[PDB]
Amino acid sequence: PTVSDLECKITECTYASDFGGIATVAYKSSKAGNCPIHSPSGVAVIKEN
Amino acid sequence: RDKGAPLNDVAPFGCSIALEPLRAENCAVGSIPISIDIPDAAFTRISET
Numbered sequence: 001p002t003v004s005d006l007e008c009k010i011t012e013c014t015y016a017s018d019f020g021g022i023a024t025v026a027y028k029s030s031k032a033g034n035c036p037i038h039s040p041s042g043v044a045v046i047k048e049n
Numbered sequence: 050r051d052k053g054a055p056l057n058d059v060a061p062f063g064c065s066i067a068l069e070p071l072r073a074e075n076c077a078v079g080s081i082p083i084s085i086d087i088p089d090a091a092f093t094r095i096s097e098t
Contacts, residue, residue, distance in 0.1 A: 012095035022096050 001031035019047040 007026035014020025021044065029035075039046060053059075057066035062078035 001029035001033055001035060003027055003029050003035055019045075 005028040007028075008023055009025075010021065010023040012020075012022050014022075027035075036049060037046060038049075055066070056073075057064070060066075060073070062076055064076040065074040066072075067074070
């Protein structure tokens with residue numbers, strides 16, 4: 001699925017080591033299925049691939 | 050019969066009395082710096098509310 005026309009926002013970001021940072025994402029898909037994710041910036045490390 | 054009145058009838062700042070451990074119950078005055086360590090198990094993680 002193409003996911004654009006979305007929105008992302010943190011909801012409780014934890015300024016920390018353990019994966020405490022969270023963020024809802026208003027996904028706006030075309031199909032329905034899986035969608036691999038990553039932050040190309042090294043600022044954020046994500047638990048979910 | 051020529052006494053004075055009782056401290057549970059003349060005290061200030063709101064107290065009651067007992068001939069018991071000599072407490073002065075329920076004295077409403079000032080503030081108390083209270084601090085608690087909650088059980089972390091009782092917390093709900095942020096991504097569930």
